[PDB]
Design an enzyme around this catalytic site. Structure first.
Site, PDB file in Angstrom:
ATOM      1  N   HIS A  39       7.708  13.118  62.400  1.00  0.00           N
ATOM      2  CA  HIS A  39       7.142  12.691  60.914  1.00  0.00           C
ATOM      3  C   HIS A  39       6.704  14.148  60.213  1.00  0.00           C
ATOM      4  O   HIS A  39       6.538  13.962  59.055  1.00  0.00           O
ATOM      5  CB  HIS A  39       5.789  11.738  61.252  1.00  0.00           C
ATOM      6  CG  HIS A  39       4.652  12.257  61.749  1.00  0.00           C
ATOM      7  ND1 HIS A  39       3.506  12.991  60.988  1.00  0.00           N
ATOM      8  CD2 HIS A  39       4.120  12.444  63.129  1.00  0.00           C
ATOM      9  CE1 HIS A  39       2.717  13.261  61.781  1.00  0.00           C
ATOM     10  NE2 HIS A  39       2.976  13.130  62.974  1.00  0.00           N
ATOM     11  N   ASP A  78       9.317  12.828  70.515  1.00  0.00           N
ATOM     12  CA  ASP A  78       8.614  13.155  69.022  1.00  0.00           C
ATOM     13  C   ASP A  78       8.887  14.563  68.735  1.00  0.00           C
ATOM     14  O   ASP A  78       8.038  15.462  68.552  1.00  0.00           O
ATOM     15  CB  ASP A  78       7.245  12.688  68.976  1.00  0.00           C
ATOM     16  CG  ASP A  78       6.845  12.820  67.775  1.00  0.00           C
ATOM     17  OD1 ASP A  78       7.298  13.107  66.665  1.00  0.00           O
ATOM     18  OD2 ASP A  78       5.445  12.385  67.523  1.00  0.00           O
ATOM     19  N   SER A 154      -0.641  17.979  65.045  1.00  0.00           N
ATOM     20  CA  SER A 154       0.547  17.548  65.680  1.00  0.00           C
ATOM     21  C   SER A 154       1.576  18.848  65.371  1.00  0.00           C
ATOM     22  O   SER A 154       1.650  19.155  64.275  1.00  0.00           O
ATOM     23  CB  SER A 154       0.983  16.156  64.754  1.00  0.00           C
ATOM     24  OG  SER A 154       0.180  15.273  65.184  1.00  0.00           O
TER      25      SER A 154
END
EC number: 3.4.21.-
Length: 198
Positions: A39, A78, A154
């Protein structure tokens, strides 16, 4: 664990492999190539914002580079590869301004680790911080560790005691010293290496 210290001058290895994206962190692994979360790479392709090489409060700037393309890992892990255009709009060369972090080839529970990134970057003018802790669990491509982490971390690299790359943070838990990462197995290492520009 909560032991978090600002890297005021990130022109030194391994801090000069760390990069800032508007809402998170990535790590340089080879020529023009960064690893981060899905993301973070993706939401950046909406505003087409630049990535800053090793931004820090006192260090000589490394340049702000445009993204060329993204390669998402096909699995659910991810993980995404971000390629940059080597020359910034200011004429700086990405490869002259960063280092390539080496892989750890795994880790063990109880290993001491560092998570380096940009916790709360939009509130600190993107200060880089290193947060230390311990690996508590490894299973497949998942790891858990207890270094303090916040929004902004992140995509942060998780490094071993020799500054080698074990994986990257992707999430925290509850309301954070229980944090989750993508642990780089041989399969994920091979994915990354196959996607470094030649």
């Amino acid at each position: 664990e909560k032991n978090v210290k600002e890297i005021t001058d990130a022109t030194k290895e391994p801090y000069n492999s760390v990069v800032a994206f508007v809402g998170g962190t990535g790590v340089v692994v080879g020529k023009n190539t960064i690893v981060t979360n899905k993301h973070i790479a993706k939401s950046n392709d909406i505003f087409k914002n630049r990535v800053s090489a090793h931004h820090s409060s006192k260090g000589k700037g490394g340049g702000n580079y445009d993204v060329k393309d993204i390669v998402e890992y096909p699995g659910k892990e991810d993980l995404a590869i971000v390629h940059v255009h080597e020359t910034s709009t200011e004429g700086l060369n990405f490869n002259k301004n960063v280092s390539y972090t080496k892989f750890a080839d795994g880790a063990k529970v109880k290993d001491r680790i560092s998570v380096i990134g940009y916790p709360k970057g939009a509130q600190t003018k993107y200060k880089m911080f290193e947060s230390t802790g311990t690996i508590n669990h490894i299973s497949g491509t998942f790891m858990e560790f207890d270094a303090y982490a916040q929004p902004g971390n992140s995509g942060s690299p998780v490094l071993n005691s020799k500054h080698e790359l074990i994986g990257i943070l992707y999430a925290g838990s509850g309301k954070s010293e229980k944090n989750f990462g993508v642990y780089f197995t041989p399969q994920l290492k091979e994915f990354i290496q196959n996607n470094i520009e030649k």
